[PDB]
Design a protein around this ligand. Structure first.
Ligand SMILES: C[C@@H](C(=O)O)c1ccc2c(c1)[nH]c1ccc(Cl)cc12
Ligand SMILES: C[C@@H](C(=O)O)c1ccc2c(c1)[nH]c1ccc(Cl)cc12
Lengths: 304, 304
């Protein structure tokens, strides 16, 4: 028993982190097969970031200007190309530690682990969720760009995120591994305000099921609701509308606990309207939304 | 910016996890050099756990009864010995992935990362603290015994914890890598109630400094206090007494922010007496105590 905000083991991704330096800028790259992927803003100075013309800036760069270091050994760059907001540097050596991998573009509400790195060296790992406004609330200092987000299914790493920017409000923005930003963000140092950070309702419900499984049951009540009634309260509290697809995804947790999804929605409705009253659920004083239903099943069953 | 509950990258420890089976019991072992370390209760059935005589149970075990598997390859056991509550199985092959390591016995209030494993396979990584009552609040299912806790200093892994038991109240107990339990716990399935789970004051203060550094400043007030006055409030709220040693440890964070330690204690005193009033600090609605001052400095400076 016990329920923790757990990240995937990071070893398979640690084996892929490299340092990329272009001029005076150093950030992280991801080395998979004979390609190194990194944010294209490695070619910018902080001055360039105000209004960068990436195609023009890239014309002044040759393969030998991209310094790629894996541990203490230098990799030879034999080609480079820009794909959306990522640079791909072709190297002459395939990464011997390349795991089985895929590039996936995640949906808002989905979770993933981040291996925060500096100078191609891993510093820490934590579990994130793609917010409904397409930002992530991470822990990224200068030099962390190029750190990646991923999920692991047995031995295959699905890379879903690469860190690019910190918005003026301290939230983070980045791309998938094809270089397309999540949300409306751009790799320019300009006013980029995020939209409403709504709560991922289906994840809060999954976490309430984890709480019931792990013994925390005080919030269970004698009520039920309907999707439409629940959604009237969800709107008021900036929660994402719950759909029948979300109810279906929560089916296995409902079956395991014997608590109908709409009964759990009624517990959540009361928690929203009445608050916690100074109580906690799974060691939290707020309703946690960075565990998907799949995460709850995985952690509660011990998937390796 | 941003502050997350971050675990150390787990790759160096993933390379050490093996599966140990004795009879019908399977748990995890830690393979370092030519020794595999695992909980001695791998020799017990659930029936034996009620009143186990470990020395007597161990007489019926020979080297060939301990099945050690590293991935899909079997390790040959050439010796075994019991050291306190851990079994050490000497194998004929040194682990080629053995990192630089130390065994350390941590103090209550110290944090570490846990690589939760099942059948010698890593499932997830999370950050824990040794509670003042010598329990940990982890995420451990049946089969997780032998999963380890550690800290990493550049390239050296300091192993500090091995999981052994889940107390009847859902909290966890375990040993250091010499097999000595933290706290008064024993490896017997019996009534083992934990003492008061007090809050680690120095860690809450470190986390309030992290909040100030990362922009969350609403809780800063116009007051100061003394250690003795603060400790009168700490006692009332089941917080650990703050010592001059704790004040000294917070010195670097006080210097960086310009907030005197006792001024931060006065902010904490007001937070204890008045509550959060529905507000959050670093995305939390409670006062977080599983970041040490060293963790805050490390994460806020990007140590790899
Ligand atoms: C950066 C990477 C990529 O775009 O995948 C890359 C970049 C350049 C090349 C590449 C892969 N393969 C080549 C084969 C022939 C020639 Cl003339 C150039 C290239
Ligand atoms: C389990 C491990 C340990 O106690 O470290 C171990 C266990 C048994 C032996 C060992 C290390 N080295 C030996 C050298 C000679 C003989 Cl006769 C036995 C052993």
């Amino acid at each position: 028993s016990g329920f923790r905000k757990m990240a995937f083991p990071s070893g398979k991704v640690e084996g892929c982190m490299v340092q990329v330096t272009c001029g005076t800028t150093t950030l992280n790259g991801l080395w998979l097969d004979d390609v190194v992927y990194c944010p294209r803003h490695v070619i910018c100075t902080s001055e360039d970031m105000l209004n960068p013309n990436y195609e023009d800036l890239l014309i002044r760069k040759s393969n030998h200007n991209f310094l790629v270091q894996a541990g203490n050994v230098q990799l030879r760059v034999i080609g480079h190309s820009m794909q959306n907001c990522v640079l791909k540097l072709k190297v002459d050596t395939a990464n011997p530690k390349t795991p089985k991998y895929k590039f996936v573009r995640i949906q808002p509400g989905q979770t993933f682990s981040v291996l925060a790195c500096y100078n191609g060296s891993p510093s820490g790992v934590y579990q994130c969720a793609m917010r409904p406004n397409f930002t992530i609330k991470g822990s990224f200092l200068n030099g962390s760009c190029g750190s990646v987000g991923f999920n692991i299914d047995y031995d295959c790493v699905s890379f879903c995120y690469m860190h690019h920017m910190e918005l003026p409000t301290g939230v983070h923005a980045g791309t998938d591994l094809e270089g397309n930003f999540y949300g409306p963000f751009v790799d320019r140092q300009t006013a980029q305000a995020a939209g409403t950070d709504t709560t991922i309702t289906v994840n809060v419900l999954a976490w309430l099921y984890a709480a019931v499984i792990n013994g925390d049951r005080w919030f269970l009540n004698r009520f039920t609701t309907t999707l439409n009634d629940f959604n009237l309260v969800a709107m008021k509290y900036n929660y994402e509308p719950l759909t029948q697809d979300h109810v279906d995804i929560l089916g296995p947790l409902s079956a395991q606990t014997g608590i109908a999804v709409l009964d759990m929605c009624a517990s959540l409705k009361e928690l929203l309207q009445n608050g916690m009253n100074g109580r906690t659920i799974l060691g939290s004083a707020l309703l946690e939304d960075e565990f998907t239903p799949f995460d709850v099943v995985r952690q509660c069953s011990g998937v390796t």
